[PDB]
mmCIF file of C-alpha atoms in Angstrom:
data_model
loop_
_atom_site.group_PDB
_atom_site.id
_atom_site.type_symbol
_atom_site.label_atom_id
_atom_site.label_comp_id
_atom_site.label_asym_id
_atom_site.label_seq_id
_atom_site.Cartn_x
_atom_site.Cartn_y
_atom_site.Cartn_z
ATOM 1 C CA UNK A 51 83.440 98.459 32.643
ATOM 2 C CA UNK A 52 82.984 97.472 28.998
ATOM 3 C CA UNK A 53 84.488 100.516 27.229
ATOM 4 C CA UNK A 54 83.181 99.090 23.954
ATOM 5 C CA UNK A 55 79.987 97.374 25.108
ATOM 6 C CA UNK A 56 79.411 95.259 21.972
ATOM 7 C CA UNK A 57 75.996 94.199 20.674
ATOM 8 C CA UNK A 58 75.452 90.500 21.378
ATOM 9 C CA UNK A 59 72.358 90.791 19.185
ATOM 10 C CA UNK A 60 74.729 91.467 16.288
ATOM 11 C CA UNK A 61 74.616 89.245 13.203
ATOM 12 C CA UNK A 62 77.256 87.017 11.613
ATOM 13 C CA UNK A 63 79.577 88.450 8.962
ATOM 14 C CA UNK A 64 79.382 85.564 6.492
ATOM 15 C CA UNK A 65 76.974 85.839 3.531
ATOM 16 C CA UNK A 66 73.438 84.638 4.251
ATOM 17 C CA UNK A 67 72.882 81.587 2.047
ATOM 18 C CA UNK A 68 70.667 78.496 1.935
ATOM 19 C CA UNK A 69 67.058 79.621 2.349
ATOM 20 C CA UNK A 70 64.485 77.877 4.522
ATOM 21 C CA UNK A 71 65.013 76.360 7.988
ATOM 22 C CA UNK A 72 67.387 73.754 6.561
ATOM 23 C CA UNK B 137 97.724 77.805 3.430
ATOM 24 C CA UNK B 138 97.044 81.429 2.528
ATOM 25 C CA UNK B 139 98.920 84.682 3.135
ATOM 26 C CA UNK B 140 97.884 87.305 5.723
ATOM 27 C CA UNK B 141 96.151 90.624 5.057
ATOM 28 C CA UNK B 142 97.602 94.111 4.602
ATOM 29 C CA UNK B 143 96.409 97.689 4.117
ATOM 30 C CA UNK B 144 97.763 97.396 0.575
ATOM 31 C CA UNK B 145 95.493 94.430 -0.148
ATOM 32 C CA UNK B 146 92.462 95.876 1.639
ATOM 33 C CA UNK B 147 92.759 98.896 -0.653
ATOM 34 C CA UNK B 148 92.750 96.849 -3.860
ATOM 35 C CA UNK B 149 89.263 95.554 -3.065
ATOM 36 C CA UNK B 150 86.168 97.751 -2.571
ATOM 37 C CA UNK B 151 84.834 98.950 0.810
ATOM 38 C CA UNK B 152 81.991 96.444 0.482
ATOM 39 C CA UNK B 153 84.307 93.460 0.031
ATOM 40 C CA UNK B 154 86.870 94.598 2.601
ATOM 41 C CA UNK B 155 84.544 93.632 5.451
ATOM 42 C CA UNK B 156 84.241 90.104 4.064
ATOM 43 C CA UNK B 157 88.025 89.881 3.746
ATOM 44 C CA UNK B 158 88.821 90.891 7.327
ATOM 45 C CA UNK B 159 86.080 88.630 8.650
ATOM 46 C CA UNK B 160 87.150 85.755 6.415
ATOM 47 C CA UNK B 161 90.673 85.850 7.847
ATOM 48 C CA UNK B 162 89.347 86.483 11.356
ATOM 49 C CA UNK B 163 87.112 83.416 11.101
ATOM 50 C CA UNK B 164 90.026 80.961 11.462
ATOM 51 C CA UNK B 165 91.932 83.322 13.757
ATOM 52 C CA UNK B 166 89.291 83.397 16.492
ATOM 53 C CA UNK B 167 88.246 79.871 15.524
ATOM 54 C CA UNK B 168 91.196 78.740 17.643
ATOM 55 C CA UNK B 169 89.653 80.425 20.684
ATOM 56 C CA UNK B 170 85.886 80.752 20.266
ATOM 57 C CA UNK B 171 84.907 78.608 17.250
ATOM 58 C CA UNK B 172 81.411 78.178 18.685
ATOM 59 C CA UNK B 173 80.477 81.632 17.396
ATOM 60 C CA UNK B 174 83.664 82.790 15.674
ATOM 61 C CA UNK B 175 81.644 84.212 12.797
ATOM 62 C CA UNK B 176 79.123 85.925 15.061
ATOM 63 C CA UNK B 177 81.747 87.772 17.101
ATOM 64 C CA UNK B 178 83.734 88.338 13.908
ATOM 65 C CA UNK B 179 80.757 90.149 12.416
ATOM 66 C CA UNK B 180 80.392 92.819 15.089
ATOM 67 C CA UNK B 181 84.149 93.014 15.656
ATOM 68 C CA UNK B 182 85.074 93.518 12.001
ATOM 69 C CA UNK B 183 82.059 95.825 11.779
ATOM 70 C CA UNK B 184 83.660 98.112 14.360
ATOM 71 C CA UNK B 185 85.954 99.848 11.872
ATOM 72 C CA UNK B 186 88.495 98.844 9.226
ATOM 73 C CA UNK B 187 90.713 101.715 10.371
ATOM 74 C CA UNK B 188 91.224 100.292 13.861
ATOM 75 C CA UNK B 189 91.107 96.659 12.740
ATOM 76 C CA UNK B 190 93.949 97.318 10.299
ATOM 77 C CA UNK B 191 96.134 98.097 13.315
ATOM 78 C CA UNK B 192 94.538 95.383 15.453
ATOM 79 C CA UNK B 193 95.937 92.760 13.078
ATOM 80 C CA UNK B 194 99.456 93.400 14.375
ATOM 81 C CA UNK B 195 98.100 94.178 17.843
ATOM 82 C CA UNK B 196 97.886 90.882 19.775
ATOM 83 C CA UNK B 197 97.564 92.939 22.957
ATOM 84 C CA UNK B 198 94.286 94.539 21.877
ATOM 85 C CA UNK B 199 92.850 91.714 19.773
ATOM 86 C CA UNK B 200 92.416 89.289 22.669
ATOM 87 C CA UNK B 201 91.009 92.232 24.626
ATOM 88 C CA UNK B 202 88.132 92.931 22.238
ATOM 89 C CA UNK B 203 87.457 89.214 21.797
ATOM 90 C CA UNK B 204 87.101 88.578 25.529
ATOM 91 C CA UNK B 205 85.004 91.731 25.891
ATOM 92 C CA UNK B 206 82.450 90.416 23.399
ATOM 93 C CA UNK B 207 82.418 86.872 24.782
ATOM 94 C CA UNK B 208 81.632 88.408 28.171
ATOM 95 C CA UNK B 209 78.900 90.637 26.743
ATOM 96 C CA UNK B 210 77.024 87.423 25.956
ATOM 97 C CA UNK B 211 76.862 85.986 29.473
ATOM 98 C CA UNK B 212 75.710 89.422 30.624
ATOM 99 C CA UNK B 213 72.419 89.223 28.726
ATOM 100 C CA UNK B 214 71.900 85.456 28.642
ATOM 101 C CA UNK B 215 73.913 82.250 28.270
ATOM 102 C CA UNK B 216 72.638 79.134 26.500
ATOM 103 C CA UNK B 217 73.926 75.556 26.535
ATOM 104 C CA UNK B 218 74.495 75.109 22.801
ATOM 105 C CA UNK B 219 77.242 72.677 21.798
#
């Protein structure tokens, strides 16, 4: 019954780069 | 190709870089199963705890378990049709 129940809303692990929508 | 990871190597680097390391190696690992959001799942997974992850590396019986668990947690809330 999901003994860990992760957070799908979580965020990637990689470093946030490249600003803007593109 | 590159070599695997080990507690000895994870110690050399700081606790702030360790996360990036585990995730970096996990990127390609899960990329063979769920490349669509390998990084996404890798973020929360590797965020769980370096203590457990360290053992998960050599634990192919638990790894797939956590992976599937997360992938399922997605459909639960909502599932999109993104290539």
